[PDB]
Design a binder for this molecule. Structure first.
Ligand SMILES: CCCCOc1ccc(S(N)(=O)=O)cc1
Ligand SMILES: CCCCOc1ccc(S(N)(=O)=O)cc1
Ligand code: NA
Ligand code: NA
Ligand SMILES: [Zn+2]
Length: 257
């Protein structure tokens, strides 16, 4: 019964998920001054040309675009990774207002939203086994700022009317996630966790330096989704972000000077 409300939100999660107070929780604030450039970091290899999107689902917390992960169709390699990580889904976190919504912050600045492309380490065979491992997942995080529209996001925006409430899904084949990326692949990286329950500490976080710009209308339509199921009282799906958590002496590395 976790969520983002006053009664079941981030302050409450530790009671059912005590790792919420763990040693490598996410998100964090990225202090750019103290993140150190690491010349041993490799460029990120994003290979999405064979991606097979399947479906979009309102899960009561966000909406997820799911992919076929039964072969190496859409993979993340390189960067800080030492393995091949398959794309399973992407989703966003966003605010009720343009001035909040991201999970990670940059020098304490919040963005309007944050995109998470979730990948699992193929040496563990399936996502379920990967989330039992400290290097099971790699999440590529991309900030959204409000400005000009993002053309590659519009197909997502225009299906949202058909998944308004929790438990609704719709076909979402032939979506190209390359249209959600910024120009640069420069990144920060650190070891962390899932940002929602069960808060498992599996994730190599890779957060891109360059935000994407989306229009006010695009993010406005995210905010018309509902946390509730059909026939229940309407609760707008807004402010589905966890605040920054203690760094606990982790270090954040930068791929760029
Ligand atoms: C009012 C009902 C609240 O019930 C709950 C049940 C679980 C949580 S948690 N620990 O998963 O966030 C929060 C509230
Ligand atoms: C068994 C795990 C199910 C939940 O999976 C997830 C996957 C990714 C995230 S995030 N927001 O850290 O990208 C949160 C939950
Ligand atoms: Na540092
Ligand atoms: Na297959
Ligand atoms: Zn997320």
């Amino acid at each position: 019964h976790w969520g983002y409300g006053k009664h079941n939100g981030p302050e409450h999660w530790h009671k059912d998920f005590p790792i919420a107070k763990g040693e490598r929780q996410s998100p964090v604030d990225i202090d750019t001054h103290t993140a150190k450039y690491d010349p041993s970091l490799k460029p990120l290899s994003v290979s999405y040309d064979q991606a097979t999107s399947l479906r979009i689902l309102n899960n009561g917390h966000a909406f997820n675009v799911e992919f076929d992960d039964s072969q190496d169709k859409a993979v993340l390699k390189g960067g800080p990774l030492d393995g091949t990580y398959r794309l399973i889904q992407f989703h966003f976190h966003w605010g009720s207002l343009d001035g909040q919504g991201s999970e990670h912050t940059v020098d304490k600045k919040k963005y309007a939203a944050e995109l998470h492309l979730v990948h699992w380490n193929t040496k563990y065979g399936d996502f379920g086994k990967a989330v039992q491992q400290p290097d099971g997942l790699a999440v590529l995080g991309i900030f959204l700022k409000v400005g000009s529209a993002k053309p590659g996001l519009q197909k997502v925006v225009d299906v949202l009317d058909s998944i308004k409430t929790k438990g609704k899904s719709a076909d979402f084949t032939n979506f190209d996630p390359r249209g959600l990326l910024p120009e640069s692949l420069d990144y920060w990286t650190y070891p962390g966790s899932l940002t929602t329950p069960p808060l498992l500490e599996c994730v190599t976080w890779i957060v891109l330096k360059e935000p994407i710009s989306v229009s006010s209308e695009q993010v406005l339509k995210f905010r018309k989704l509902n946390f509730n199921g059909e026939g229940e009282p309407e609760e707008l799906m807004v402010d589905n972000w966890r605040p920054a958590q203690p760094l606990k002496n982790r270090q954040i590395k930068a791929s760029f000077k």
